[PDB]
RNA sequence: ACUUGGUUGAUCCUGCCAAGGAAGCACACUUAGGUCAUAGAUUAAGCCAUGCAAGUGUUAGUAACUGCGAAUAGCUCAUUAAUACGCUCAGAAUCUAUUUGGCGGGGAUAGCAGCAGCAACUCUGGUGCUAAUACAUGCUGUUUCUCCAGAUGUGAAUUAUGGAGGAAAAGUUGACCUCGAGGCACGCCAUUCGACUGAGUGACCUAUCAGCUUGUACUUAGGGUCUUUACCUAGGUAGGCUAUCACGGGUAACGGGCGGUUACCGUCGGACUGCCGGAGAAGGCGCCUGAGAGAUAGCGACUAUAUCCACGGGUAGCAGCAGGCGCGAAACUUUCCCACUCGAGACUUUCGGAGGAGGUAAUGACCAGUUCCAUUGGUUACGUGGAUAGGGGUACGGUUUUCCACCGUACCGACUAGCAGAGGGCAGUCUGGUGCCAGCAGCUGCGGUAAUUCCAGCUCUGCGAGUUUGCUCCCAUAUUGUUGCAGUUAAAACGCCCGUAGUCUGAAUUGGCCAGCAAUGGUCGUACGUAUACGUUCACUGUGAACAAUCAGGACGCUUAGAGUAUGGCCACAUGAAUGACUCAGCGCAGUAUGAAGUCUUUGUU
């Protein structure tokens, strides 16, 4: 697969997070955020 | 609670029938208004989609309606008769429906002569407006709908009720 | 999901039927003796339908779309002929005009492979293609059209490395 | 003829061959069950702990003792007899172990010379006697 | 006991989508709606796979929430909203003008249209009934309320309906010799002239002709008034519901 | 569409018992590689340490409040023998947040600030303020009763709606965000996802279960409900179900789509079944909030297990994901992840043990290697001659959110087979040891010092990364018989006659003749009712409507195959994702051969 666009407007818009990085562009929520309902 | 649901109950063929489930709020029957007289009040209820069900706890008035003139007065009910259904109803002057309550009349009365001085009037009715209690049928559902109004009792109606009561 | 390719045979030690089955693997150069009993079975989904279509009438909206379809894909494989292509010669067909039809042994008619045996070991280790695509596998059946495309992928009889 | 074949006459067959199903002694035996009131329990491997060693013999014409242990079995508390089969064996079994015993294979029924027992015995300790007869693996 | 459920499988998602056993579990639900569950098409779906410009659903909820898309005038941010039958899809930038309508087969297909054609839409009447102040009113198969509409305008009749004003210019009559797509059962997406209309006592029947000179029935709801007498208002597919025959 | 060993001195039989084929749990021995799928259901719906699974912030309501969510998804099959499930209908007897279209019309707290109390908890007290699309205020309809009419709509409503009267607040009163546009309310009707009520009907055994049923069955009036009903309370009758199997008992019973076995007919299994619907959260029972719950990662109590205690008192429900104890023949990692599929929400951002990927396992399915090509001597398989791999190793390019493993590219290269047998059913009369002993052996049989069956070696056979061994189960089996068995003597015809339920029930009704290849079309017969359609319905046949995956089947070289829904054209195009079966009942038109009903006669119909 492959496309292409007119300008730099797309890729930093529409695409995907982790072909950025790729290109060249952990639990820790789960855990230690809920103890903000564990303590008020 | 107080179920509304059948299963439980025997077949046609007289089975002894079986559960397979709880209790459910699909089938909850609630208790009896049980709407005496004396002292206005009523008790709002949430049911199901939301909705008022305003039950009706003991009236004085009911909003009563002479049915061949078209006229219709609030009026004061003052006890219960007779009740086709039980006797009970009777004794603890119970407003339900179907339920033969006498009515003070004084609206009616008053209409008659600011009106006319047509009318006419029956023979059996003059023999009940000099007391000033008329005989009257309870037709509405006082504990779902909340408030009760009946038409007069008339014609071939008050020589039947008439017997029942002596 | 899934199917069961192969049968296994009803009665395990008949002499008639393990010394015949011996003389289609010699011919045809092959491993074990279930990869007969697959070919058993696929001539078996074969006739099995065919049998029924013959059942019906002669004029039947099944019998006509069906029958036309299924004649088209044994003309791919090249078990019949145009002399034969008439649906009740479809319950005639060996399992040896159907074995003939694989890769192995169109290497072999081909004689690139110079021997049946040899035309496995020619596929198993990748030097055969066909219509420059590698074929590893040394049970392709091939549809005729193709047959003629048959030649060495590249590798050792090409490239000539050690 | 012998039995009613007219078109409304489905009631008759359905119903009479419920009947003769009973005869069949597969079908009583399956549905009576019948079965649960057997040291197997109707499961095909049971284990527990050896009693003991006994040797019972053979019937007839086969003059032979056949060295068969007694095994309390685990889920029902129950005593039964158990074959131990291959030369040796008996020797490599050891007194008070855990075993695991399956069936003569004769879907039930005794099965050679040897009367009363039903069962034999297919690992010592978790281990597996053709293991051991072999000497392929080991016990302490 | 079953309550109003989120989570659509594949499988029991519809036929007509034309969805992947693969490609996961769960299928886009589509939102409540004019369209019922079973008839429509979202445009998360539409999207996917039909145009195929949105490759993934993260592309596909995208482009709606940027405000290109428009259902039939309105905008329409939601999403997984149902469209099926006679509604107009424009679309910003790139614009193009669809209209949404049976293949053959049963199967949903799209198809580039005039402009000057693309402003109405049809409807269909399914119900009639007298409400405030003895006036006359219909409800459509989308569920648009026409109240104050004209005299003839009985039940299984269509409406040509102009869309920038709430207007109903036309009305196509029910009868013998008019042309109906049928829009459920085994003959959805066929179009037929209307031969005979046999009423049916109680719970009827209502027999059709393509231009071939094939024949088949259907009960009366499935079928869709399209136009009076040969010429439809509107353009139809390829093929032209006549559907293959080998 | 298949047979063979076993009653006899031998025979032909009946007859089973074994052998034989498949799958599905479990045990065993053995093992290059690949893709893919599944895995604590069977017994203990037994018990649980720890970590985590349902939360939710937009340029636009003001950590909290407020709004919505948490009733779905996930797990399990203990109840349940039809009330559930399925499949037909039905609402004119109903409710419905959210979407969508119409029609409308000032004061008081929460965080924040401060003073305290407990052995302890995601408990709080009390004071000091301030928020609003939260709450209350406010410039013709809703609900109900009476009467008069009752549509252009329906099979059908004195229904929808209209008018004339009274009542009642249960009330529609944009008191509103962000920069001319977007968004958010309120009410009513519809709509959508549904829900909930009712009907018809289908199916596991049992007669050592023949009578069962008191709200039990009808009716009139009421209460209650979202509505209808003995759902419940009254008055009045005394009914209902049953040999066409009621009622009772049993289930090692969740129902269904379907799965295994098969020539057809069938038959066994269905926790799961990659889906559908129901039920349950340790056991009953009760209830608040809400559109929706008799919710259980909501509340309340009791009971039974378990645990803490500073001895006052409490704390917790893994049949969610891992993990352990126990149970047993029997079933995996306390990992990584929000990218795919989707879902919740104020939402393109947050969160999801739903979901996705690795890791362990011969459980299951397909694929597949352990070499090859030459020619010297011994009888064409038993120092040479060279070739070609992948198993494996090391880089780098693809791949995916990240590893692994795969798919490539180049360089290193002269360890890979068992399991079961060798009297017959169904390849040795080899040599050695054993001597009715050890032992083998499904069955018949072998072993008593000559073993073609034991224990070993050698040779040979089968199947082959598979192959034996248990129990359940189908075929073999026409040994469950509708197709399709048998009953003189092998097992099997009531001791005889009457006889009800039950099943079964002679002939007869509009044809002949010619053109035939049928469909049909002419002639012979005129039998002269309705007044261009009406004059019995069914069963049966044809045709038409109605009603996912799997099964069959079409298209397409996933390198092939099992699979999957694709994929094929170098210039922006063409497609395909059919059809049939699933199938009994219920529904329409057409045909009347067979088979039924229709047909009150000491005189019937208009």
Redesign the interface.
């Known amino acids: 697969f492959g496309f292409v666009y007119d300008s730099l407007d797309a890729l930093k818009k529409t695409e995907p997070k982790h072909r950025l990085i790729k290109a060249g562009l952990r639990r820790m929520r789960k855990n230690a955020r809920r103890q903000k309902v564990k303590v008020w | 609670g107080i179920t509304r649901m059948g299963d439980l109950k025997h077949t046609k063929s007289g089975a002894r029938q079986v559960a397979w489930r709880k209790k459910r709020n699909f089938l909850a029957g609630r208790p009896s208004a049980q709407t005496r007289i004396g002292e206005k009040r009523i008790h709002a209820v949430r049911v199901r989609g939301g909705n008022l069900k305003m039950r009706a706890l003991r009236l004085e008035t009911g909003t009563f309606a002479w049915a061949s003139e078209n006229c219709t007065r609030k009026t004061r009910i003052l006890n219960v008769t007779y009740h086709p259904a039980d006797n009970d109803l009777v004794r603890t002057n119970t407003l339900a429906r179907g339920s033969v309550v006498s009515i003070d009349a004084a609206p009616f009365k008053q209409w008659y002569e600011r009106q006319f001085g047509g009318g006419v009037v029956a023979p059996e009715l003059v023999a009940e407006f000099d007391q000033g209690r008329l005989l009257a049928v309870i037709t509405s559902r006082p504990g779902q709908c909340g408030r009760a109004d009946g038409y007069i009792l008339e014609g071939e109606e008050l020589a039947f009720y008439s017997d029942k009561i002596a | 999901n899934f199917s069961r390719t192969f049968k296994k045979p009803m009665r395990p030690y008949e002499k008639e039927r393990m010394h015949k089955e011996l003389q289609v693997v010699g011919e045809y150069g092959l491993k074990n003796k279930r990869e007969i009993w697959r070919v058993s079975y696929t001539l078996s989904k074969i006739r099995h339908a065919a049998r029924e279509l013959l059942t019906l009438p002669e004029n039947d909206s099944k019998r006509i779309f069906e029958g036309a379809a299924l004649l088209r894909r044994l003309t791919k494989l090249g078990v019949l002929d145009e002399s034969k292509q008439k649906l009740d010669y479809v319950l005639s067909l060996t399992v040896n005009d159907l074995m003939d039809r694989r890769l192995q042994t169109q290497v072999h008619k081909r004689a690139l492979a110079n021997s049946v045996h040899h035309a496995r070991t020619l596929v198993s280790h990748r030097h055969i293609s066909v219509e420059n695509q590698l074929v590893n596998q040394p049970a392709f059946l091939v549809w005729k059209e193709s047959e003629k495309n048959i030649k060495y992928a590249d590798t050792s009889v090409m490239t000539t490395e050690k | 003829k012998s039995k009613a074949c007219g078109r409304l006459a489905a009631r008759k067959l359905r119903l009479a061959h419920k009947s003769n199903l009973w005869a069949s002694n597969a079908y009583r035996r399956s549905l009576g069950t019948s079965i649960y009131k057997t040291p197997l329990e109707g499961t095909s491997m049971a284990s527990g702990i050896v009693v003991g060693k006994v040797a019972v013999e053979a019937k007839q014409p086969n003059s032979a003792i056949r060295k068969a242990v007694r095994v309390q079995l685990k889920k029902n508390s129950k005593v039964v007899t158990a074959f131990v089969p291959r030369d040796g064996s008996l020797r490599l079994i050891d007194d008070n172990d855990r075993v695991l015993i399956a069936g003569m294979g004769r879907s039930g029924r005794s099965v050679g010379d040897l009367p009363g027992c039903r069962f034999k015995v297919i690992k010592v300790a978790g281990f597996s006697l053709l293991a051991l007869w072999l000497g392929k693996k080991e016990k302490p | 006991?079953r309550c109003q459920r989120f989570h659509l499988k594949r499988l029991t998602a519809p036929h007509h989508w034309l969805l992947a056993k693969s490609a996961g579990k769960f299928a886009s639900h589509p939102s409540t709606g004019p369209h019922k569950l079973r008839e429509c098409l979202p445009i998360n779906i539409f999207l996917r796979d039909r145009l195929k410009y949105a490759?993934?659903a993260?592309?596909a909820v995208?482009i709606v929430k940027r405000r290109l898309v428009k259902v039939d005038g309105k905008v329409r941010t939601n999403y997984r909203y149902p469209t099926g039958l006679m509604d107009v899809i424009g679309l910003g930038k790139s614009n193009e003008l669809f209209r949404i309508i049976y293949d053959c087969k049963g199967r949903f297909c799209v198809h580039h249209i005039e402009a000057k054609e693309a402003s109405f839409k049809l409807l269909r009447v399914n119900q009639f009934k007298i409400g405030a102040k003895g006036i006359p009113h219909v409800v459509t198969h989308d569920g648009r309320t026409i109240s104050y509409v004209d005299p003839s305008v009985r039940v299984h009749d269509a409406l040509k309906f102009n869309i920038k004003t709430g207007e109903v210019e036309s009305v196509i009559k029910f009868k013998v010799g008019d042309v109906a797509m049928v829009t459920a059962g085994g003959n959805v997406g066929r179009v037929g002239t209307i031969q005979k209309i046999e009423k049916q006592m109680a719970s009827d029947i209502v027999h059709l002709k393509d231009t071939s000179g094939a024949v088949f029935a259907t009960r009366i709801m499935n079928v869709f008034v399209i136009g009076e007498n040969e010429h439809p208002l509107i353009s139809l597919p390829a093929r032209e519901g006549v559907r293959p025959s080998?």
């Open positions: 006991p490759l993934t993260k592309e995208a080998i």
